[PDB]
Write a protein that binds this DNA or RNA. Sequence first.
RNA 1: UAUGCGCAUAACGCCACAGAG
Lengths: 307, 126, 47, 107, 67
Amino acid sequence: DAWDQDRFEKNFRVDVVHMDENSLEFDMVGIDAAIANAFRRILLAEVPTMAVEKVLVYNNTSIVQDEILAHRLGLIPIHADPRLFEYRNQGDEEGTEIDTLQFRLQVRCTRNPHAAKDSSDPNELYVNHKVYTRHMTWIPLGNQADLFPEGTIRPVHDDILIAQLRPGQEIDLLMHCVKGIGKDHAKFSPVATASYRLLPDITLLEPVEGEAAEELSRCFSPGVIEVQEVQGKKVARVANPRLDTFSREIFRNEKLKKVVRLARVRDHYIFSVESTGVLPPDVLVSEAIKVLMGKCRRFLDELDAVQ
Amino acid sequence: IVNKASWERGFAHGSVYKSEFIDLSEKIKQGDSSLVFGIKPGDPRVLQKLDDDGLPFIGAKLQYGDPYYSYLNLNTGESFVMYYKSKENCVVDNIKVCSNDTGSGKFKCVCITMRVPRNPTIGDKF
Amino acid sequence: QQPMIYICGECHTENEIKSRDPIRCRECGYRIMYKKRTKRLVVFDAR
Amino acid sequence: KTALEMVQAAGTDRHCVTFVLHEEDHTLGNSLRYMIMKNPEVEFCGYTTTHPSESKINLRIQTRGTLPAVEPFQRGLNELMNVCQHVLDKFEASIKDYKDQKASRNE
Amino acid sequence: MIIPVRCFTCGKIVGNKWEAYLGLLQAEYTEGDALDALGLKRYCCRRMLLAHVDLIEKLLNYAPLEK
RNA sequence: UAUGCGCAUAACGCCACAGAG
Ligand SMILES: [Zn+2]
Ligand SMILES: [Zn+2]
């Protein structure tokens, strides 16, 4: 049987379960594991983001040492739109307005002069004793201050604890953000995790009644088996089998392992995309589909350049 | 097998701190007993690579062949420089300077401590 | 210009040490002195 | 600069050619293998990654009659692109359906 | 030493949840309930914060300047 | 012989501990 595009467009549908900021559960119905895993792998490792690459330290008197603090700072998500920037070329130590961002972190811990009152907590004894992510100040280079409104280029989370100081200690450094894909380094990955699972279909091969219905309700996840008193006696039925986690606990009950059938619905996926905050997750899934279209267009242009 | 993305996040990252105790009396025994760490001012072998006491900066990195320390002879004037002969790039951690037991010792014992990164690579044992 | 500051191990006071003078802290006479870290550019990769 | 190498067999038939796709892994390879195996005029198709140190895949296509194995490769690329375009349209329409139903049911 | 920025296994930002975790545990929550109130659902995320030993407060008792 | 730029510097054993397979 050939590839019928019309049959695919009849049987394919997307059902959105829940979408807030930084999470998205949806369904893909009637697509194969090859393409669904392609989308999952693009979301993991090939949708580009902006992340700190070079850290120019000037003074670092903290105990969080320098090459550790650089890696520390590279793992912070930078809330930029990566589609407005470009790849820095091979060998450019100095990036321009097109392809880099700058952040200055300059925090000095001093002792709180007044209002200490011989206490013990560090929040009263010291000032700037914890270096958070709100201390990172964006340094616009070129015309980036006019291109981006104020408060747009920033880290995603302010209150990620970078380091921790004591009086006298100082962190003075400058960060350069570049664009890359998560195949290169995991700091560029835009998702917390992106994954899928096929939808389970639990069916009852035999009517289950009485205390066996309560055992059946407890051998599954809370919610899939609705045990209900129709006559006063209890019968069990499957109600929303999406909740089941395949603990397969019903296969340990010797009597009731013959009345159910756990399988999966073929080609019915449940994706979950959890953005770190760089882009909204529906935008991440759109860009992840466009990446695979770009791969196909890349090799079609290679074939047309050979011909 | 280790996940690449876990290794690229902070999984099992490390360091090793090598401390090299440098004594100009014990090793550099040429005579005259008047060697002190320092540079001859205007030396093109140590420019912006050792500090004015002939001793590397504390933030500094050390590749192979970089100047490691410089010491000058006080009764002569000639300054020597010693180069970093290890093949691993390290970052200077601290430099402590030592006297003798009386506080009368001269600027000739030092103890450089360097950090070598050593994150988990292919071939490391868990 | 730009003196070489060393920090005592005990009292943590800043000590200038030239080539010829004996090394000991000018306040407490302690024998170990740590070199001061000064502001100077070093470049690291966030990786 | 060249991402695609076409390696014909020792026979000059052009019906059994290995495609070497540089800077590529299981994503495009497995999706293309799925879309090329839908062609009735394809005798054999599989991909493999050569070594983990390298970043490329070998992709074999063997056709039956007189068509060269460049035509199923190009047709599989176009069909996978059309698949992804339709998935993009369905996904964006469903997300827009969610954002309109949600913003009006709380008001 | 210091709370990791991301979880090791998945890349979930866990570095902004250490002070929230301590404030939940001082408010007399169970550690399982305190990990639920932070939204740590996978046990990879949940061991990153459950098993974190924070050596930087012990390592800053030797703070040099003491001034 | 090695490094550095024909030139300058550095040119090892014996015990004892500890470890790897
Ligand atoms: Zn002193
Ligand atoms: Zn996790």
